[PDB]
From Swiss-Prot, chain A:
One of its GO terms (cellular component) is nucleus. PROSITE patterns: PROTEASOME_BETA_1 (PS00854), PROTEASOME_BETA_2 (PS51476). GO terms for biological process: proteasomal ubiquitin-independent protein catabolic process; proteasome assembly; proteasome-mediated ubiquitin-dependent protein catabolic process. CDD domains: proteasome_beta_type_4. Pfam families: Proteasome. It comes from Saccharomyces cerevisiae (strain ATCC 204508 / S288c) (Baker's yeast). Keywords: Cytoplasm, Nucleus, Proteasome. Disulfide bonds: none annotated. This is Proteasome subunit beta type-7. PANTHER family: METALLOPROTEASE TLDD (PTHR32194), PROTEASOME SUBUNIT BETA (PTHR32194:SF6). Present with 16900 molecules/cell in log phase SD medium. Belongs to the peptidase T1B family. The lineage of its organism: Eukaryota, Fungi, Dikarya, Ascomycota, Saccharomycotina.
UniProtKB/Swiss-Prot annotation, chain B:
This is Proteasome subunit alpha type-6. It comes from Saccharomyces cerevisiae (strain ATCC 204508 / S288c). Keywords: Cytoplasm, Isopeptide bond, Nucleus, Phosphoprotein, Proteasome, Ubl conjugation. The proteasome degrades poly-ubiquitinated proteins in the cytoplasm and in the nucleus. It is essential for the regulated turnover of proteins and for the removal of misfolded proteins. The proteasome is a multicatalytic proteinase complex that is characterized by its ability to cleave peptides with Arg, Phe, Tyr, Leu, and Glu adjacent to the leaving group at neutral or slightly basic pH. It has an ATP-dependent proteolytic activity. GO terms for cellular component: nucleus; proteasome complex; proteasome core complex, alpha-subunit complex; proteasome storage granule. There is a cross-link at K190 (Glycyl lysine isopeptide (Lys-Gly) (interchain with G-Cter in ubiquitin)). It comes from the Eukaryota.
Length: 233, 233
């Protein structure tokens, strides 16, 4: 049993007709201190998978190392490592899920909330969540922590059920996610304005965007607000 | 000579030989013949079951390791049980942890390594059994030949056991032919039975004497014994 020290906030994601999109800001908080700002919480594995991690950062770095090893190991005595026998998003997820549950069962968890986003070899979109309890689930949209309360409601307005996926384009999807990131910056006291976003399309492959920023924010109305009730000036 | 260097597997002879390993290999030759061959859609195992008395049963020679993999044995049955059981676990582990079916090539590597440990240490003994492994994985149909020396090889077809050389020359000749028997199991099986009968001498393959197994594209590894093999005698 432990307690998280340096932490990453929300990880939001959703699937569209040809793939999945996932994003996470670049902050590493230390309690209420917004300590680190160049933290990448989106971990690409191969070119068909991206693992988004929230929670304890030291554990995240540990999962990072685990992931690099999987790649190395899978390459050993594997002549089809970059083909039929390359790592699938579902393999990467089942692995992590396995680890997460074993660690909670030993009463020594990896204090994280993880979302694995990717495209299977047959083109199917893959989006599943696993956390420090070993709990797992899938949904057209998935968000961790804070984004579960504020991002899912927005993303679900785009893809409310399975039949909505084929009707959603990368543009609409990326738009929804980018807007969600802005909302999270408005109400989440542990968020950052900078973030990374990744897209895994069954055609265009993996697109990884770094150094994005929340833009087009509305703050002007703040000038018209004074006092907390009766004050006039 | 030999006598002074064949007391255990941990001793090299003056010529660089490992007699205990070679003696183990001899147990295979004394084993009943079995054949293996594959096309691009299927893989077949044909084994001649041997009986003790005419009041006894014909000992099973095919073991299923998973829905997509299995093997035939020639030599010490108990050793086949041990090795196949290890293979069952390895297949199982791959599924439970990575939600991935184990590659036939990987299974060959694991078997090679398990057998090797029993040829470099004192106290143990080499395994005294030969195995033919077939399976359908992410890269198609496969056939492997496992020797107690730890040497595993991938082939289009082969045979092991007493008088196996007959069937092997037949296959090495029928190559261009059977390798193209795609989409037609019964044809591949008949081809297998024709290869195995090339090693007969004592009797002729009967109903409770013939044993067949197949795996492929849309065929889960399954065993046919008795009445079920009649249509091939």
């Amino acid at each position: 049993t432990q307690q998280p020290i340096v932490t990453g906030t929300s990880v939001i994601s959703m699937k569209y007709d040809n793939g999945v999109i996932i994003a996470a800001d670049n902050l590493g908080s230390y309690g209420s201190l917004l300590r680190f700002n160049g933290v990448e919480r989106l971990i690409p594995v191969g070119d068909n998978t991206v693992v988004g991690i929230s929670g304890d950062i030291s554990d995240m770095q540990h999962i990072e190392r685990l992931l690099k090893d999987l790649v190395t190991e899978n390459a050993y005595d594997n002549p089809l490592a970059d083909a039929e026998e390359a790592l699938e998003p579902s393999y990467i997820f089942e692995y992590l899920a396995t680890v997460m549950y074993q660690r909670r069962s030993k009463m020594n968890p990896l204090w994280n909330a993880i979302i694995v986003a990717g495209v299977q070899s047959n083109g199917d979109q893959f989006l599943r969540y696993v956390n420090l309890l070993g709990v797992t689930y899938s949904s057209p949209t998935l968000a961790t922590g804070f984004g579960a309360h504020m991002a899912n409601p927005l993303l679900r307005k785009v893809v409310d059920r399975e039949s909505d996926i084929p009707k959603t384009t990368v543009q609409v999807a990326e738009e929804a996610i980018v807007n969600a990131m802005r909302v999270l910056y408005y109400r989440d006291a542990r968020s950052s304005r900078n973030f990374s976003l990744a897209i895994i399309d069954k055609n265009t492959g993996l697109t990884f965007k770094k150094n994005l920023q929340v833009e087009n924010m509305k703050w002007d109305f703040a000038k018209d607000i004074k006092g907390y009730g009766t004050q006039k000036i | 000579f030999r006598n002074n260097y064949d007391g255990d597997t941990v001793t090299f002879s003056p010529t660089g030989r490992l007699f205990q390993v070679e003696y183990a290999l001899e147990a295979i030759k004394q084993g009943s013949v079995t054949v293996g061959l594959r096309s691009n859609t299927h893989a077949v195992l044909v084994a001649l079951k041997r009986n003790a008395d005419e009041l006894s049963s014909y000992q099973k020679k095919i073991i299923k390791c998973d829905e997509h993999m299995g093997l035939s044995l020639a030599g010490l049955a108990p050793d086949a049980r041990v090795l196949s059981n290890y293979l069952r676990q390895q297949c199982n582990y791959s599924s439970l942890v990575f939600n991935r079916k184990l590659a036939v090539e990987r299974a060959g590597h694991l078997l090679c390594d398990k057998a090797q440990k029993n040829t470099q240490s004192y106290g143990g003994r080499p395994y005294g059994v030969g195995l033919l492994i077939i399976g359908y994985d992410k890269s198609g149909a496969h056939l492997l030949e496992f020797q107690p020396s730890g040497n595993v090889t991938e082939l289009y077809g082969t045979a092991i056991g007493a008088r196996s050389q007959g069937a092997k020359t037949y296959l090495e000749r029928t190559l261009d032919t059977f390798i193209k028997i795609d989409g037609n199991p019964d044809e591949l099986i008949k081809a297998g039975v024709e290869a195995i009968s090339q090693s007969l001498r004592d009797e002729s393959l009967t109903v409770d004497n013939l044993s067949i197994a197949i795996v492929g594209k849309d065929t889960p590894f399954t065993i046919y014994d008795g009445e079920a093999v009649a249509k091939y005698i």
